[PDB]
Amino acid sequence: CIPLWGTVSIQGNRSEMEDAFAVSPHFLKLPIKMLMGDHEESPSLTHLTGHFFGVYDGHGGHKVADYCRDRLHFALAEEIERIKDELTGEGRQVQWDKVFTSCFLTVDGEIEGKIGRAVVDKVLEAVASETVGSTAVVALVCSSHIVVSNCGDSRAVLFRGKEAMPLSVDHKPDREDEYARIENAGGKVIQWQGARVFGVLAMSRSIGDRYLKPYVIPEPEVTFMPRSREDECLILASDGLWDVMNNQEVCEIARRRILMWHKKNGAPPLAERGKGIDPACQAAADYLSMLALQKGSKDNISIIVIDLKAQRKF
Amino acid sequence: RPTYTTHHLAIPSGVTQDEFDELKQSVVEFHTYQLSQNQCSSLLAQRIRAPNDVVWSIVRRFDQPQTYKHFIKSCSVSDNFTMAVGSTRDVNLISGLPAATSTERLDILDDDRQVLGISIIGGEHRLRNYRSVISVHGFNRDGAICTVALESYVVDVPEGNTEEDTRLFADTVVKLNLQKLVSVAESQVI
Ligand SMILES: Cc1cc(=O)n(C)c2ccc(S(=O)(=O)NCc3ccccc3)cc12
Ligand SMILES: [Cl-]
Ligand SMILES: [Cl-]
Ligand SMILES: [Cl-]
Ligand SMILES: [Cl-]
Ligand SMILES: [Mn+2]
Ligand SMILES: [Mn+2]
Ligand SMILES: [Mn+2]
Ligand SMILES: [Mn+2]
Prior knowledge:
The complex is a heterodimer of chains A (314) and B (190).
Chain A: E1 5-10, E2 19-31, E3 47-59, H1 63-84, H2 89-111, E4 133-134, E5 136-141, E6 145-151, E7 155-160, E8 163-166, H3 176-184, E9 189-191, E10 195-197, E11 207-208, E12 221-226, E13 231-237, H4 239-242, H5 247-265, H6 279-294, E14 301-307
Antiparallel strand pairs in A: 1-14, 2-3, 3-4, 3-5, 4-11, 5-6, 6-12, 7-8, 7-13, 9-10, 13-14
Chain B: E1 3-4, H1 17-30, E2 34-35, E3 39-48, H2 52-59, E4 72-76, E5 88-93, E6 101-110, E7 115-122, E8 131-141, E9 144-156, H3 163-186
Antiparallel strand pairs in B: 1-2, 3-9, 4-5, 5-6, 6-7, 7-8, 8-9
The structure holds ligand QPZ, chloride ion (4 copies) and manganese (II) ion (4 copies).
PDB class: plant protein
Keywords: CsPYL1, Phosphatase ABA receptor inhibitor complex
Assembly: dimeric
């Protein structure tokens, strides 16, 4: 499972950069039991290497998105470690949503100054003002599965065969279920330059945003996706991209740009692959970001393109 | 003839009936607006465990709203700013809001009564013709000293929205700022 990825993260027309992202290849040794069981004989198989990808679209400031970039994948590894020191198909799905929910809630509480943070003891102190928050869309990729955890309106989209498949659903306050959840919790949603919690925040879930607890919650939606030979690419991006471009078109453009690079340049020597960005993926991320600006996106724009094909021959 | 707000007819949330028997008079004095067509108006109150001189010293700093309000990235005043009535400030708001900037004029700065009044005269936002007044009121509760801040506003209802929408949004922001003022004022008093 050689990690093939490329990234662009631009400020664009905005006065501040509040997008952040993290890529940590070979970051985790995922216990093989969290992905699959045994079946008729791979005794050497004890774990699979997990690659971490995250995009964090900050709002009200940059410090929460930056904290997610620096912290969130370590909070995830800590959750998985608690499972290695404490150790079914349907069970795997529930296990992964518990792991990611605990991770997202831990980071949210650290940000709010309510959970102690490690001090090279633990310190209780808000990372940012109570009006600062961030989306988080995170993907764990291994040879057998993709796990996506999403909180907010950044998005992960899997291109499988010829179909773009969103692996997250935007947490917007006018989503039927999110609207009901907010009002059931005592909150209000107002159309005020778009659907907004109390007219202020155009998002129903986020990391941070202490002032809108418990209407704006950090609980993510988690997707446990078996991989398929038909998988082409996985795209994580902030809404600086999705606000001007369609899911299907983004995936298809990324695939076509990856193939164009390979047709013109051949593949890199496999000894060099997986160390840094993949040039084909980088070309796709570059092209998508320039299209988004050409289409008039006035936002920060952050894109991770991940090639899911082992090889691409013509 | 012209219509006027009637915030003196109801005790605002967070005030006691005893407190309101005094504060009612202040609502008439400082928190009564002549209403224009399609406008919205609200009166909010916030109790503060600090002496009214401490609260006022914070509130009166028209050039430094970020010290006791949320949502502000930066605030600039004139090079020769002297805090006279008629001063203006240009405020840049943090991201993610249904607003980006605000230009505001200082209309009342009464150190003798501890009343601050501001009118929004520009910016990128949907609270057109917003005018507000905050007044500070000290109480001596048999040795125990506290303050009640009263803050009201009048604003146009933007096209496409209702008065209920507008009050919900404006009240939310005012209430949040009043909660910061509590924290800032109480942290200066033992
Ligand atoms: C004008 C305005 C509109 C808007 O929708 N919002 C979110 C604001 C947020 C803050 C401010 S500000 O702090 O510059 N003045 C203090 C203040 C606070 C609240 C309402 C008016 C003025 C102004 C606005
Ligand atoms: Cl901006
Ligand atoms: Cl910040
Ligand atoms: Cl193309
Ligand atoms: Cl290309
Ligand atoms: Mn943002
Ligand atoms: Mn939160
Ligand atoms: Mn958007
Ligand atoms: Mn954005």
